[PDB]
Write a protein that binds this ligand. Structure first.
Ligand code: RTL
Length: 133
């Protein structure tokens, strides 16, 4: 299914530190953020996504329209501009973030009651799993 609406609570987080290191997130921030359980809130209406990813330390919001390239400013992350494009490959939501970093993007998809997220940068892959609230 393509319905990713809802509040999603993290069950699993694999190699988040490697992903952050590839983004050149500073040590203090990495070492706190790797500790944390995340929540994702997604509002999806047709093409239009509004997403909020939260932790006790820092949040990240990004909104986009599927199939419409946009300038993403990764504030609170590595603070870079990328040309972001989110599309559907089957039922997998695929984002490519064009810019300074090679192989940068993510893939997000539903399996049953869970949301899977794969974050890539350079040669690093972070895999996350969230359960629907
Ligand atoms: C790195 C980093 C963080 C960012 C998490 C990420 C990478 C969010 C990705 C959002 C996406 C892919 C939306 C579709 O779900 C948080 C704020 C948790 C803590 C501070 C350091």
């Amino acid at each position: 299914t393509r319905d990713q609406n809802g509040t999603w609570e993290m069950e699993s987080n694999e190699n988040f530190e490697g992903y952050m290191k590839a983004l050149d997130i500073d040590f203090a921030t990495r070492k706190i953020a790797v500790r944390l359980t995340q929540t994702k809130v997604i509002d999806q209406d047709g093409d239009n996504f509004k997403t909020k990813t939260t932790s006790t330390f820092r949040n990240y919001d990004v909104d986009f329209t599927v199939g419409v390239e946009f300038d993403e400013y990764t504030k609170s992350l590595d603070n870079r501009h990328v040309k972001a494009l989110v599309t559907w490959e089957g039922d997998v939501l695929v984002c490519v973030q064009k810019g300074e970093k090679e192989n940068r993007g993510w893939k997000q998809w539903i399996e049953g009651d869970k949301l899977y997220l794969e974050l890539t940068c350079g040669d690093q892959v972070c895999r996350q799993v969230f359960k629907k609230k």
